[PDB]
Design a protein around this ligand. Structure first.
Ligand SMILES: *[C@@H]1O[C@H](CO)[C@@H](O)[C@H](O)[C@H]1NC(C)=O
Lengths: 50, 50
């Protein structure tokens, strides 16, 4: 995280009204000829972090 | 059929607009806040979400 300052402006507002306790992030993988394998091992991810 | 649920409402459709006057002491209700004053043009520019 760089040592800087920046403000966050609002994006959306959802009138949902449910109970939230947990969450999970998704991901997009890639499957090509350079990563042979089945649906459980033949994929590539890419460089990312959060 | 009408449903009542423990959630904020989404359909009310008030409508009932009114024209505009300037430089005259009039009562105004722009979005839900009341007041009693005069209107004119301002030079300051709001941020897009203000
Ligand atoms: C879920 O949220 C509601 C708020 O309407 C609350 O009354 C309730 O105790 C919460 N937990 C549940 C339903 O387990």
């Amino acid at each position: 995280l760089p040592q800087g300052f920046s403000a966050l402006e609002p994006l959306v507002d959802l009138p949902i009204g449910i109970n939230i306790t947990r969450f999970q992030t998704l991901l997009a993988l890639h499957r090509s000829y350079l990563t042979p394998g089945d649906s459980s091992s033949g994929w590539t991810a890419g460089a990312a972090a959060y | 059929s009408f449903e009542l649920l423990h959630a904020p409402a989404t359909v009310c459709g008030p409508k009932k607009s009114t024209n505009l006057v300037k430089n005259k002491c009039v009562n105004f209700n722009f979005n839900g806040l009341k007041g009693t004053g005069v209107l004119t043009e301002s030079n300051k520019k709001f941020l897009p979400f203000q």
